[PDB]
């Protein structure tokens, strides 16, 4: 029967109704989809349901109806009311009302799982196994039970090649799958999933999805999953809502809702052609090996010869763990290669760059900007400080405000949105507003070579087309060369021109994005 | 209530120590080093990339119910869960504006959740990485607590706090993290605080003139301001010593009548 | 400005925008520019100021014909600006001087 109700709740943040008139009902087992634009309020609503600090309602309330042991503090599924405890006592049914200091809240909060958006809730130094082992031990199980699960689990998110590998040294989506496998292994009453797949490539996303079903839908644990990327909302949820700017634009069967949402949408802007101009970078036998006396060699880049031709947009597509981030860090002179040559044609001289110093790598590093896949801002500074004063803008402070506003507008914010966003902290933004702010922070210094590790990933098709036309305009009006690591194919077709495929540290073949597509499929 | 005095004394050195200890005293800033430049000199993380984590965020981890523990608000870097990093400073005895015990006392009086350590030629403060970067930029580097000549952000090999200054008035550095650029008159960090070279040298500004260094220093010197000119501090030190002696002998009110 | 030698000094316009007119700097005398006379309240009109070593553009001189409570005559905040003097008698020529042109000053104490 019924798990939680949502009364008429209007969440506001200082004359900012992030959410208003939100109400839905769930039962013991069902998947609920939360579909909407970027900044619609999905992360706020999931932190709202989780009961995190600062997400208390101003108008309404939500009721959690659970089972409970008054001698054991175990919360359970409401369906357990009528069954026999794992202790003495039988059970008792509670209408825990969150934000009402209702004791059970603590136990219930322990019984609910959350997949945070772009935040890896892992111990870092506790490898992969101990991280998942922790989840089991923490939640309960036992030596054998844990072991069985641990192994059965590492199989589901596909991590048998990284078992003893330190989770701090993992790679993006691998950490995402690690956090996921930690998140099933607690027996929740509810699994709130914020962008559960992440900027994950089709294939790995499919494994994550099946793993989710294989587990949460088997234990009839209700699912609240957001993706403003529909194809999952359909393949996972049966009842989904569509909200727009915090207001439920629709509440229906997931199929109809996804249809309606996708109609609201736009196609790409297929820009005009561009001719490129000479080779700028030349990498010859670039290798990057991570040797351990305790886990083996991880040949991240295994011999890679690439060339970029100056004003051009270069793509790097592949599967998770192929070596794209390691390659992009080698290009940006962040991570030195174990072996191999890299020369950057500053203007006509090719500086040997596996040599640190202003006399050598520095020369080209003034005009190299990198947006990292695991990006960050300065949370103690404002957005305006982040664009202008945190990195060092070569202009007086009076005239930096309109420069930052122009950069935010060029990224794809409106004038009102960029004006309202300037006097704000990064914690007050959404994941996708922070991503665009970090992209603007890379772009505002106007470097020559720009590396963009997954610019998209949390952008509605519309926001993505926006960031896209941005890169295209800046490349032509400013002859900026770009290197793009991406998973969205249509972004590569309508943006890139000479993408390359990476598979296990190799380059396989380089060519047109359509040619890359027919090589992939 | 109680109005907090911070340090006894009438001299300029005691006034500077009181100003450093005072959390309501706004330290005068003398340079602008950007946040990413401070991160680059710190050498812990690449600027623009996310902070490495040591544990899940405090909402994700489940703790026992503790009323006294939950009364204290954690730091933001503790809320998200970040590794604890350090920033280390060496201070010359020749009129450096900040001094190691003064640095430790001011850090523990002004900052939350910090780990201060004091040596003769070393002073280190440890905190969560985001908060540590915040007060490294806001207080430690750009204000009158820092002078690029007589002080320096340095780990690894530290030596030269008691040595004489060089021809440019800078503290001796065995690894030469910061050099003097005579064309601009500024000190530039060519290496980070531990010693690996930087790809782009970072301007930490120009050396403070010696006349200002006499006014803003917190050390007592015969050629500057000596403790013989500040008898109030010596009397307080002697009173503390006598009170410790009397408490260690017999800790009663009648034995403290001879205080 | 050259008033150490002659009775009339020369200021060169370096950058101009509406109310602001910034003058050229000398990267040979701007060494000990410690923050000296920093504003406490809103800066009034016709105030000459030099940015101290705190800001990146240390030594640049400027003046604005209006008043604001946030930024000094050179586009920097108050902690990065030290007031050196003011324009007393002759005005309405800072709004009709192009970039690169030299204006001449006379000290009236």
């Amino acid at each position: 029967m019924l798990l939680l109700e949502v009364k008429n709740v209007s969440k506001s943040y200082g004359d900012t109704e992030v959410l208003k008139n939100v109400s839905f009902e769930l039962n013991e087992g069902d998947v609920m989809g939360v579909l909407g634009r970027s900044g619609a309020g999905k992360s706020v609503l999931l932190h709202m349901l989780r009961g995190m600090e600062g997400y208390e309602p101003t108008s309404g309330q939500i009721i959690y109806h659970v089972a409970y042991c008054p001698h054991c503090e175990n919360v359970e599924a409401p369906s357990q009311v009528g069954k026999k405890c794992e202790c003495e006592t039988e059970y008792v049914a509670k209408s825990v009302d969150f934000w009402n200091n209702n004791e059970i809240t603590y136990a219930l909060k322990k019984k609910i799982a959350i997949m945070l958006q772009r935040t890896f809730a892992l111990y870092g130094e506790k490898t992969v196994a101990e991280n998942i082992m922790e989840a089991l031990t923490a939640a309960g199980y036992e030596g054998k039970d844990a072991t069985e699960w641990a192994l059965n689990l590492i199989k589901m998110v596909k991590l048998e090649h990284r078992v003893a590998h330190i989770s701090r040294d993992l790679s993006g989506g691998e950490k995402q799958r690690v956090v996921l496998a930690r998140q099933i292994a607690k027996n929740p009453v509810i699994f709130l999933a914020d962008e559960p797949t992440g900027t994950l490539d089709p294939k790995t996303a499919k494994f994550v999805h099946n793993a989710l079903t294989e587990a949460v839908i088997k234990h009839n644990i209700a699912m609240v999953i957001t993706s403003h990327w529909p194809e999952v909302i359909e393949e996972l949820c049966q009842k989904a809502i569509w909200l727009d700017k915090g207001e439920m634009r629709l509440v229906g069967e997931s199929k109809h809702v996804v249809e309606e949402f996708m109609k609201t949408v736009t196609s790409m802007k297929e820009f005009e052609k561009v001719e490129v101009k000479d080779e700028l970078l030349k990498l010859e036998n670039v290798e990057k090996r991570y040797v351990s006396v305790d886990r083996g060699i991880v040949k991240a880049v295994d011999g890679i010869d690439v060339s970029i031709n100056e004003k051009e947009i270069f793509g790097l597509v592949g599967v998770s763990g192929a070596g794209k981030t390691t390659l992009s860090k080698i290009i940006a002179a962040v991570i030195p290669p174990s072996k191999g040559n890299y020369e950057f044609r500053l203007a006509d001289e090719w500086v040997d760059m596996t040599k640190v110093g202003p006399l050598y790598r520095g020369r080209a590093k003034r005009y190299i900007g990198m947006l990292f896949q695991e990006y960050s801002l300065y949370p103690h500074r404002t957005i305006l400080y982040n664009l202008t004063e945190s990195i060092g803008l070569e202009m007086p402070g009076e005239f930096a405000k309109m420069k930052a506003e122009h950069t935010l507008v060029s990224v794809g914010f409106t004038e009102e949105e960029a004006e309202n966003m300037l006097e704000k902290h990064p914690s007050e933004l959404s994941v996708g507003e922070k991503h665009r702010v970090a992209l603007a922070q890379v772009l505002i210094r106007e470097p020559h070579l720009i590396l963009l590790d997954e610019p998209t990933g949390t952008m509605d098709p519309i926001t993505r087309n926006q960031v896209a036309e941005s890169i295209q305009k800046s490349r032509s009006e400013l002859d900026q060369t770009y290197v793009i690591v991406s998973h969205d194919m249509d972004f590569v077709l309508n943006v890139c021109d000479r993408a390359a495929l990476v598979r296990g540290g190799k380059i396989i073949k380089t060519g047109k994005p359509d040619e890359i597509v027919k090589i992939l499929s | 209530a109680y109005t907090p005095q911070f340090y006894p004394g009438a001299t300029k050195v005691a006034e500077n120590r009181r100003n450093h200890l005072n959390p309501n005293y706004e330290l005068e800033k003398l340079r602008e080093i950007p946040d990413e430049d401070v991160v680059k000199i710190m050498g812990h993380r690449q600027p623009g990339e996310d902070y490495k984590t040591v544990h899940p965020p405090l909402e994700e981890m489940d703790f026992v119910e503790d009323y006294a523990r939950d009364l204290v608000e954690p730091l933001n870097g503790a809320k998200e869960g970040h590794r604890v990093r350090y920033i280390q400073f060496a201070d010359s005895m020749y009129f450096a504006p900040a001094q190691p015990y003064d640095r430790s006392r001011s850090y523990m009086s002004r900052l939350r959740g910090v780990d201060a350590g004091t040596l003769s030629g070393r002073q280190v403060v440890e905190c969560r990485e985001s908060d540590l970067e915040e007060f490294s930029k806001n207080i430690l580097m750009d204000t009158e607590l820092f002078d690029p000549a007589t002080s320096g952000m340095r780990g690894a090999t530290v030596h030269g706090h008691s040595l004489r200054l060089d021809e440019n008035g800078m503290m001796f550095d065995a690894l030469q993290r910061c050099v003097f650029d005579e064309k601009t008159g500024h000190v530039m960090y060519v290496k980070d605080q531990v010693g690996k070279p930087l790809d782009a040298p970072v301007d930490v500004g120009e050396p403070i003139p010696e006349a200002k260094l006499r006014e803003i220093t917190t050390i007592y010197r015969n050629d500057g301001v000596a403790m013989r000119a500040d008898p109030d501090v010596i009397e307080v030190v002697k009173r503390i010593h006598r009170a410790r002696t009397l408490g260690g002998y017999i800790p009663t009110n009648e034995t403290f009548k001879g205080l | 400005t050259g008033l150490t030698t002659k009775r009339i000094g020369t200021l060169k316009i370096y950058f101009k925008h509406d109310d602001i007119s910034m003058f050229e700097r000398d990267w040979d005398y701007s060494k000990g520019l410690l923050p000296e006379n920093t504003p406490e309240k809103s800066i009034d009109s016709g105030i000459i100021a030099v940015t101290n070593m705190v800001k990146k553009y240390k030594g640049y001189i400027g003046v604005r014909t209006s008043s604001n409570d946030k930024y000094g005559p050179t586009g920097e905040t108050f902690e990065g600006t030290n007031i050196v003097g003011k324009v007393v008698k002759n005005s309405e020529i800072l709004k009709s001087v192009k970039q690169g042109e030299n204006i001449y000053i006379l000290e009236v104490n």
């Binding site: 520095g362 | 650029d181 060519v190 | 950058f15 990146k56």
Partner: peptide, 25 residues
């Protein structure tokens, strides 16, 4: 914009020009 280009040309502290000790010879 014209003002953005004017600011970029007028206030470009080039590290090679300002710090010739390191980026040159």
């Amino acid at each position: 914009r014209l003002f953005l280009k004017a600011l970029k040309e007028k206030f470009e502290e080039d590290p090679k020009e300002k710090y010739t000790k390191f980026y040159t010879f």
